[PDB]
Amino acid sequence: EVQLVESGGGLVQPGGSLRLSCAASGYSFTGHWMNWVRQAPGKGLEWVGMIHPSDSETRYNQKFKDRFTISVDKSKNTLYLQMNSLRAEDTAVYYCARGIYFYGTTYFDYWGQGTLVTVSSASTKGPSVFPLAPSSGTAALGCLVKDYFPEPVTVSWNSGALTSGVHTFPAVLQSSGLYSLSSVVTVPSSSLGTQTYICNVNHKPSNTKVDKKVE
Amino acid sequence: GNVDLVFLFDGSMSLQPDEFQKILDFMKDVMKKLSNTSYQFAAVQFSTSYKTEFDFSDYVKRKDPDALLKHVKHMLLLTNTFGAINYVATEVFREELGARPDATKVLIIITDGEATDSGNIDAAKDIIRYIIGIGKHFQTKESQETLHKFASKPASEFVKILDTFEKLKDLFTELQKKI
Amino acid sequence: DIQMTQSPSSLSASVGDRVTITCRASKTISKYLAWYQQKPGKAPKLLIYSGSTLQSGVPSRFSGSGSGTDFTLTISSLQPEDFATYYCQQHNEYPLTFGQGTKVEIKRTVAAPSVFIFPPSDEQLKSGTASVVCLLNNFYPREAKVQWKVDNALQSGNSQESVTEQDSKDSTYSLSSTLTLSKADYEKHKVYACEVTHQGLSSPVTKSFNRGEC
Ligand SMILES: [Zn+2]
Predict the structure, then answer these.
(1) Residue A152 backbone dihedrals phi, psi, to 5 degrees
(2) Most C CBs within 10 Å: which of A62, A93, A130, as the mutation test of the C interface?
(3) Range of the domain at C86
(4) Could you say which DSSP state residue C93 is in?
(5) C143 and C211 fall within a common domain
């Protein structure tokens, strides 16, 4: 199974640096070109460049050749991306994708899940989870993950054993400057009181793992 | 002692981007196993035209199977096999490109369909040829027998037809069990 | 240099309809153009490469075609799962350039939102901030008004809404509006009503609770 896992993102101060990682699994690493494609919150995609594991031949988009450096570690089958003097615009999700060099130039067929890089001079903050208790034949209960920076926050319920009727809403930026969002789920009106409902609130940047049982 | 080996692989249109890939990896497993030796390879891709993907002096210079086949591009065309075998015999086995006169010239052909042109390979009379028929077009016997002409006799030894491209890993392991 | 323009920047089509997105190029690019499908929050998935060829795994309903400068992605017989932003990129010269995409949304029948209202948790009261959260589940279209009323007072400037992307199966949205106050202005009032006016709703539906009882 071709697998492209990513890591290394988070919050970085302007004029700072950060090195992303792309751990690939499932194919012969030194046989395919590897690319880095970023995506500005809610915008188009942008190509950064490509490198070839076998010897590190590289080809960049000029826009990124001045600050972005690409390298690799054949030993670990890991792809890296060195970014310097980052600015507000460089905030985006950076994916790494394997690519086919056979036709024309290059088109990508196996992408990674993505990594959110936020460039701001604000400080990381841990989220707080407040229960959204159920009504006093369908009822819903949620978890409110308040004040936390930067993004993102992942939320699942009962270790992921409960997926139906689960809605985790997009993070909303509040005037304080922190983010906040909720995560609700609709369950039978009968299972309440007897069935235990816990959400799992994980904020990676601020390394905050909170488990919150509702009611 | 030393043997110059050439890879004449098919980049026709009946090749899927995944099937082509297995062909490039087979050639990569062949060179890894046979590196650290007298051997010194070259590769030429044929379809309608004929391109040498890397010659003998490029090998001695680079040596890394992977890094040599990185700028390879699928041609998606015809399968002019005759013109290929001749191109390899008068354009590739040359000392300007870095062929050793004292070496025994070998050619491994890898096609997935019947030749698309006509002529003869009398120029590559002194070039031991191994042809390999891959799959789904080499199923009936009338087709398998057409590859006999490109190979050396007995064709019984020099011609190898495979059921699937996934059977190339197998042929690799059959050459790891040989002499 | 190579500007890829896509059209339209978004569209809604009933399940089953034949969709067609066009991506025109700056300067010809032979038949080299690929198409990707980005589901919300996930990574683009290759679909079509070299103008019209289907990737192995892509359902037949996806089709490409065109050459030179004008290409078109043709989704014949849209589905409820086919919800996402469809990107187009050329692979004939560097640097590789992409399009701007086109959000393709699934048009359905009207849907009534189920209103709910949540009284601030006391754990948040011991913080000094109260946030009342109102929920509207599985509705359509996406447009829907929410009005906050603290003892018949329309709370303006102190509310925010969170609308979810369409459901990959069911096709409906969901929203979440919250009201931020001071544990001072909260425990200063009892009635807290959430007003929801949706197309689906024959008449404005309100849910609410009393402070100190909930
Ligand atoms: Zn063929």
Answers:
(1) -115, 180
(2) A130
(3) 1-108
(4) S
(5) yes
